[PDB]
Amino acid sequence: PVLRSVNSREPSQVIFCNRSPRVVLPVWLNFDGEPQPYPTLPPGTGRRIHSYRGHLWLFRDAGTHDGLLVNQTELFVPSLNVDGQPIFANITLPVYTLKERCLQVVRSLVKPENYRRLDIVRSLYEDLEDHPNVQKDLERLTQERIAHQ
Amino acid sequence: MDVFLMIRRHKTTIFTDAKESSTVFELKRIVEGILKRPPDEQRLYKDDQLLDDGKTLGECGFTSQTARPQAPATVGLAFRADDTFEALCIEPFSSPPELPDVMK
Amino acid sequence: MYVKLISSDGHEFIVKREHALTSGTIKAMLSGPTNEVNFREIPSHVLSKVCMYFTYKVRYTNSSTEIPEFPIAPEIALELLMAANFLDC
Amino acid sequence: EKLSPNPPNLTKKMKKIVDAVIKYKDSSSGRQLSEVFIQLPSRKELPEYYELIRKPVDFKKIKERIRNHKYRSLNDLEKDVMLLCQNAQTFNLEGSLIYEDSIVLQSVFTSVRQKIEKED
Ligand SMILES: Cc1ncsc1-c1ccc([C@H](C)NC(=O)[C@@H]2C[C@@H](O)CN2C(=O)[C@@H](c2cc(O[C@@H](C)CN3CC[C@@H](N4CCN5c6cc(-c7ccccc7O)nnc6NC[C@H]5C4)C3)no2)C(C)C)cc1
Ligand SMILES: [Cl-]
C-alpha cells in the first residue's frame, strides 16, 4: 500500500501560508511515496510555489517534525487553478493533546540520552522516545486514506 | 469578543468566559449560580481596582488579547460577611520545584 | 453546569463539566470513584494549567481561527506531563 | 553513422525482440513497463543522471542502432538493453518503481530473445 504523488504533468500554483508559530518544513511525497524536504517557512511568512495537480504534501515543524495541519487536514493535494488564482495551503498548529504538548516541551529541554534519568513512570520514557516521524505518520495516513480510494 | 477569566477568592478559582460587552453585574450573577452568594454580597476586582456593577468588562480593561483561553485574566472576589466585606485575599498557587539537572 | 477539581494543596478549581470531560479519567471519577474530584498528587500550579488546557482545547477544537501555542514553563513541564498521562488528555 | 547492412533475418529478429520488450505490459495493471525508458530525460531535467551514468542509452537509441546496423549480433543488442537496465538500477533506489521495472525488463528481454531465436 503506497500514498504518493500522481505524475499528472499539470502545473498548479500554490501559496504555502505559514499561520503557525513554528518554522514549517514542506514535505513532498514523490511518485514512490518517499518524503522529500523543501525549503522552510519562518512563522508569519508565505510563498507562491509551483507544484502539479495530484501531488501530495504534508507540513511539519522543521526542527522536531511535530505534525502540522494544512487547510485543517494532514495532507494537501493541489487541484487545477481557476481564473489565475493560486490554491491557498493554510498551515496551522493542531490542538495537540496536553500529553503530546508536554512531551514536545520535555523533548526540547532534555537530550534523548538523559530521558531515562527523569523521575517518571517507565511508560513515559517510551512516550518520550516515540519521536514524531514522517515515515511512521505515512504508515498511519496510508491506512486512513484506503477508505478515501 | 470572548474574554477568558479566572474569578479567584482565597483558594477558590472559577474558569469561565464572558462577552467584552457583558457587565460586572452579569459576572456576579454567574458567580451567584456557582458559589450561592447574591451579587450584593460580592465585590469583583481587576488588580486592586473595585469594578462597578454597570461597567462592561471591556470598560474595566479586560480584552480578548489579554484574556486568552491558555492565559486567562484574573478577577478578584471578596464576600460580605455579616455587615462588611473582607479584604480581597487571593491565595497563590504552589511553587514548582527547581529545574531538574538534565533540563539545564 | 460546573464541577470542582481540588489540588493536593487544597485549591478548588471550578470548571464546566463539558471542559473537565476532556479527561476520560475525570469522566470516570465523576461517575462513581458528588460533582467534585480530589487530586492528592496534583498541586495547584499543575491543576490550574490543566484547567487552562481544557479552556484552550474546547475553544480551538474544530475552529478556523488561527491556533496559538499552548505555553508550558520548563519548571512545570515534568509535573504537567505526569498529570496529562494520568488524566489521559 | 549508418554501418553496412546486417543480413535481413538478424535485423528482423532484433526488431521483433525490442518491439516485444517495448510493448510488454504488467499482466494485472496493463501498464507498459518500457514507457519511462523510451527517451532519456533532458540534461536540464535530470543533470544528476548524466553525472552518475557514464554511457546513457534509451530504447529510442537502441532502435536507432538496430536500424543503422551498429549491432552485429543479438549479443551486441542484449548488451545495450542490459546497460539501459543496469543504468536505471545504478541511478534509482532498489524498490523504486523505475528500479523494479528495469529488473522485469531484463527478464522480459531474455524470455523474448529465447522465444524469437527458437522461431526458425
Ligand atoms: C521556494 C520554496 N519554499 C518553500 S517550498 C519551495 C519550493 C517549491 C517548489 C519548487 C519547485 C519549483 N517545484 C517542485 O519541486 C515541484 C514541487 C512538487 O510538485 C514536485 N516538483 C517538481 O518539480 C518535481 C516534478 C517534476 C515533474 O515533471 C514531470 C512532468 C515529469 N518528471 C517527473 C519525474 C521525472 N522523471 C524523468 C525520468 N527519470 C528517469 C529516467 C531513467 C531512464 C530513462 C530512459 C532510459 C534509461 C533510464 O535509466 N531512469 N531513471 C530515472 N529516474 C527518475 C525519472 C524522473 C519527469 N513533476 O514533478 C521534480 C522535483 C521531480 C521549489 C521550491
Ligand atoms: Cl522529510
From Swiss-Prot, chain A:
Q: What are the recorded Gene Ontology BP terms? A: amyloid fibril formation; cell morphogenesis; cellular response to hypoxia; negative regulation of apoptotic process; negative regulation of autophagy; negative regulation of cell population proliferation; negative regulation of gene expression; negative regulation of receptor signaling pathway via JAK-STAT
Effect after changing residue 98 to P:
In VHLD; type I-II; abolishes release from chaperonin complex and the interaction with Elongin BC complex
What result follows from mutating residue 96 to D? In VHLD; type I
List the GO molecular function terms: DNA-binding transcription factor binding; enzyme binding; molecular adaptor activity; protein serine/threonine kinase binding; transcription corepressor activity; transcription elongation factor activity; ubiquitin-like ligase-substrate adaptor activity; ubiquitin-protein transferase activity
Tell me what effect the entry lists for residue 51 to R: In VHLD; type I
Outcome of altering residue 68 to F? In VHLD; type II
Q: What is the effect of changing residue 18 to H?
A: In VHLD; type I
According to the record, mutating residue 104 to R results in:
In VHLD; type II
Q: What is the effect of changing residue 47 to P?
A: In VHLD; type I
Q: Which intervals of the chain are annotated as region Interaction with Elongin BC complex?
A: 97-106
Noted disease association is: Pheochromocytoma: A catecholamine-producing tumor of chromaffin tissue of the adrenal medulla or sympathetic paraganglia. The cardinal symptom, reflecting the increased secretion of epinephrine and norepinephrine, is hypertension, which may be persistent or intermittent.
Q: What is known of its domains?
A: The Elongin BC complex binding domain is also known as BC-box with the consensus [APST]-L-x(3)-C-x(3)-[AILV].
Put simply, this protein is called von Hippel-Lindau disease tumor suppressor
Q: Which species is this UniProt entry from?
A: Homo sapiens (Human)
What gene is this protein translated from? VHL
Swiss-Prot record, chain B:
**Pfam families under this entry?**
ubiquitin (PF00240)
Primary subcellular site in the record, as a coarse category: nucleus
One GO location term (cellular component)? VCB complex
- PTM sites of type Phosphothreonine: 84
Ranges where the Ubiquitin-like domain occurs: 1-66
Q: Which SUPFAM superfamilies match?
A: Ubiquitin-like (SSF54236)
Keyword Protein biosynthesis applies: no
Q: What keywords sit in the KW lines? A: Acetylation, Host-virus interaction, Nucleus, Phosphoprotein, Transcription, Transcription regulation, Ubl conjugation pathway
Q: Where in the cell is it found?
A: Nucleus
What is any one GO biological process for this UniProt entry?
protein-containing complex assembly
Indicate yes or no for the key word Phosphoprotein.
yes
What is a GO molecular function of this protein? ubiquitin protein ligase binding
Q: What InterPro entries has UniProt attached to this entry? A: ELOB, Ubiquitin-like_dom, Ubiquitin-like_domsf
Q: Where are the transmembrane segments?
A: none
Sites of N-acetylmethionine modification: 1
Family the UniProt entry places it in? Belongs to the Elongin B family.
Its assembly, as annotated, is: Heterotrimer of an A (ELOA, ELOA2 or ELOA3P), ELOB and ELOC subunit. The elongin BC complex interacts with EPOP; leading to recruit the elongin BC complex to Polycomb group (PcG) target genes, thereby restricting excessive activity of the PRC2/EED-EZH2 complex.
Question: What is the protein name for this chain?
Answer: Elongin-B
What organism is this sequence from?
A: Homo sapiens
| Gene name of the record | ELOB
Curated annotation (Swiss-Prot), chain C:
UniProt-listed InterPro entries: ELC1, SKP1-like, SKP1/BTB/POZ_sf, Skp1_comp_POZ
Pfam families listed in its UniProt record = Skp1_POZ
Q: Which GO terms describe its cellular component?
A: Cul2-RING ubiquitin ligase complex; Cul5-RING ubiquitin ligase complex; cytosol; elongin complex; nucleoplasm
Origin superkingdom: Eukaryota
What GO MF terms are annotated?
A: protein-macromolecule adaptor activity; transcription corepressor binding
Q: Look up the record and give one Gene Ontology term from the biological process aspect.
A: ubiquitin-dependent protein catabolic process
Reply yes or no: does the keyword Nucleotide-binding apply: no
Which cysteine pairs are joined by S-S bonds?
none
Cell location: Nucleus
Q: How does it assemble?
A: Heterotrimer of an A (ELOA, ELOA2 or ELOA3P), ELOB and ELOC subunit. The elongin BC complex interacts with EPOP; leading to recruit the elongin BC complex to Polycomb group (PcG) target genes, thereby restricting excessive activity of the PRC2/EED-EZH2 complex.
By sequence similarity, the record places it as follows: Belongs to the SKP1 family.
Q: What is this protein called?
A: Elongin-C
Q: Which organism is it from?
A: Homo sapiens (Human)
User: What gene is this protein a product of?
Assistant: ELOC
UniProtKB/Swiss-Prot annotation, chain D:
Instruction: Extract the coiled-coil ranges from the record.
Output: none
| Residue stretches making up the Bromo domain | 5-116
Result, substituting residue 36 to A: No effect on binding to 'Lys-15'-acetylated histone H3
> Which sequence positions carry the modification called Phosphoserine?
4
- Which cellular compartments is it found in? Nucleus
Point out the annotated site residues (description: Required for binding to 'Lys-15'-acetylated histone 3): 91-92
- Expression sites (tissue/organ): Colocalizes with ZEB1 in E-cadherin-negative cells from established lines, and stroma of normal colon as well as in de-differentiated epithelial cells at the invasion front of colorectal carcinomas (at protein level).
> What protein family does this chain belong to?
Belongs to the SNF2/RAD54 helicase family.
Q: Can you quote the domain comment?
A: The KIKL motif recognizes and binds the NET domain of BRD3.
What does the record note on quaternary structure?
A: Component of the multiprotein chromatin-remodeling complexes SWI/SNF: SWI/SNF-A (BAF), SWI/SNF-B (PBAF) and related complexes. The canonical complex contains a catalytic subunit (either SMARCA4/BRG1/BAF190A or SMARCA2/BRM/BAF190B) and at least SMARCE1, ACTL6A/BAF53, SMARCC1/BAF155, SMARCC2/BAF170, and SMARCB1/SNF5/BAF47. Other subunits specific to each of the complexes may also be present permitting several possible developmental- and tissue-specific combinations.
- The protein's name is SWI/SNF-related matrix-associated actin-dependent regulator of chromatin subfamily A member 4
Q: Which organism is it from?
A: Homo sapiens (Human)
Top-level taxonomy: Eukaryota, Metazoa, Chordata, Craniata, Vertebrata
